[model samples]
Target: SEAVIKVISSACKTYCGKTSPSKKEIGAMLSLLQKEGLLMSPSDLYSPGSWDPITAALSQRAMILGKSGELKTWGLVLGALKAAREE
Candidate 1:
């Protein structure tokens, strides 16, 4: 559980620009994942197989964030996948 928490916290920082997601944001993210057929419980976040889809989705978001001048967010999403292969 501690490892999971650590990973998630690290991921949140990496993917969310070090800004903690609110419950509403998390709910919306989960809903989006569900609509995309990627929802498999929170534990699925740790799965290596999930990385491609996750990065794909985050890439889309990064594009949007980039266009909006949120480069920090974009960089984090891009960097988060650096460890995907190690998973």
Candidate 2:
């Protein structure tokens, strides 16, 4: 089931700041999220419907903080991520 999480990480840009993760990583993880009972494969991620439900959830969450403040402190990221964290 967990294999359904389609994560996509990328290489560093101008400088690989060892401080924190990159925006691309965040975007990828956003795309990686899979819905409950959702079935998919690697190619599914490339499909137009790929991770739509999960990403939609994440997308809505981001809007909560999209107009705002910090990264680690954001409820959006922390909450959606919380789903996978307990495991």
Candidate 3:
């Protein structure tokens, strides 16, 4: 969704200013979140095609949040995702 993309776009600038997430970066995020406790596959929980962009964007942003050690970004990221779903 547009909401997910917005957060990730800004996160890209904050982390590396790379403009967008690459393929491997997105996969890393999926692995990270899964290891973080998202037991259900994203595809199982979401519309497969539409959700791919969200997952990819999130992975890069999440990594930066972790590496930066800014604890708030975690809540921000997760909260944003939850809010987007609610909408």
Candidate 4:
């Protein structure tokens, strides 16, 4: 469990790197998360108890691979989501 949490936290750091997203962007992200049942509250993302571990893990991985400044990131993130959905 600790190992999983460590992996998650590391991935989260990469996913949430210092990128100043606009309020509109943030709102969109929250709305999307809410629609998918991944977010229950405005601040739940920061509360480990509120998140689904697998979803959080995949989300972090997606964001990291998607924002890596590589063109393949987009495709990889999408593919990851697709795989996650299938699972």
**TM-scores, one per candidate:** 0.43, 0.27, 0.32, 0.36
Task: Show pairs that collide, candidate 4.
Answer: none
Give the CA lDDT, 0 to 100, for residue 72 in model 2: 31
Best by TM-score: 1
The 10 consecutive residues of candidate 4 with the worst lDDT sum are 68-77
**Candidate closer to the true structure by lDDT (higher is better), 3 or 4:** 3
* Strongest candidate by lDDT: 1
- Write out the backbone clash pairs for model 2: none
Instruction: Rank all candidate structures by their TM-score, best first, as comma-separated numbers.
Output: 1, 4, 3, 2
Which digits, one per residue and each the tens of the lDDT, describe model 1 over residues 1-87? 244345545676755565644433444444455555775664455455665766566667657666422333323433544454355
Assess the local accuracy of residue 61 in candidate 3 as a C-alpha lDDT between 0 and 100.
Answer: 62
What's every prediction's RMSD, in angstroms? 6.0, 11.1, 9.9, 11.8
Task: For residue 32, give model 1's deviation from the true position in Å.
Answer: 1.6
lDDT of candidate 1 at residue 32, scale 0 to 100: 52
**Model 2 agreement with the true structure over 4-55: per-residue lDDT tens digits:** 2323222222122243344544544434443323334332433443344645
Instruction: List runs of model 2 lying over 4 Å from the truth.
Output: 1-32, 35-43, 50-55, 64-87
Pairwise TM-score winner, candidates 1 and 3? 1
